[PDB]
Design a protein around this ligand. Structure first.
Ligand SMILES: CCCCC[C@H](O)/C=C/C=C\CCCCCCCC(=O)O
Length: 260
């Protein structure tokens, strides 16, 4: 290690530190619950209509209720991600407008990155890990709701194969937020300078933590293309909902985000 790389390590430690402080459910905790490393942290499995009402006692119409649940957790994440953002060096010093723009386009890409930590080919964790809803149950929901989660799962399965851990992800989502190609950015240069530093930190982090993983750095940046697609698709389905479901409300915070 040299004087320059040492600064990168310092930045990684910081971000990873702020990550833990901002997200109550890390991937480490999620993988531990999902892989039987438990007896005290075993989740209740929801795989059908009956287990749904059963769990609602342990952890209108089902479909809508489930969707209303996703909303609640989304707003939660936005709040958490927004708190993590503030710890990214230089972030809060940027033009307020840009701060708003970066969160606007970055929040959902981050959510799907982290939501993968709570997934496996067969399902996803819910209620801070207390529950576990099967991929099949969600895919059987009343249309067009049964189409909501499938795309996320497909991504998660591929993304999870990279075997990244919390310390890697902490820098990675920081890179996501600080994107100079966001639409409407007033001052791009300042942002790119921060991202340039994060990328440097990520690269070193991946090299050190994943020595036998060839071109993990490059393979990880390409995943950013997968996230964009998932976001584009979500908005489309969300539009359909807005019209076929005029009696269902959407949290204003989330509304201000999709107006892109
Ligand atoms: C990165 C964001 C983490 C999201 C955590 C959230 O609990 C997981 C959602 C995964 C699929 C949504 C299915 C609907 C879940 C309905 C209940 C959610 C709950 O009570 O936690």
């Amino acid at each position: 290690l040299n004087p320059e790389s040492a600064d990168l390590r310092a930045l990684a430690k910081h971000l990873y530190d702020s990550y833990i402080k901002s997200f109550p459910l890390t991937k480490a905790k999620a993988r531990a619950i999902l892989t039987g490393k438990t007896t005290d942290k075993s989740p209740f499995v929801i795989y059908d209509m009956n287990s749904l009402m059963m769990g609602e006692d342990k952890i209108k119409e089902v479909a809508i209720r489930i969707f209303q649940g996703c909303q609640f957790r989304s707003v939660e994440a936005v709040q958490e991600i927004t708190e993590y953002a503030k710890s990214i060096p230089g972030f809060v010093n940027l033009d307020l407008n840009d701060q708003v723009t970066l969160l606007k386009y970055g929040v959902h890409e981050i959510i799907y990155t982290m939501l993968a930590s709570l997934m496996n080919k067969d399902g996803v964790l819910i209620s801070e890990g207390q529950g576990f809803m099967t991929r099949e149950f969600l895919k059987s929901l009343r249309k067009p709701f049964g189409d909501f989660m499938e795309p996320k799962f497909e991504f998660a399965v591929k993304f999870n194969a990279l075997e990244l851990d919390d310390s890697d992800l902490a820098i990675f989502i920081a890179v996501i937020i600080l994107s100079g190609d966001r639409p409407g950015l007033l001052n791009v240069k300042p942002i790119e300078d921060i991202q340039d530093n994060l990328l440097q930190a990520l690269e070193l982090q991946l090299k050190l933590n994943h020595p036998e993983s060839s071109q993990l750095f490059a393979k990880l940046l390409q995943k950013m293309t997968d996230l964009r697609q998932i976001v584009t698709e979500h908005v489309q389905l969300l539009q359909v909902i807005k019209k076929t479901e005029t009696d269902m409300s959407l949290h204003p915070l989330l509304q201000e985000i999709y107006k892109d």
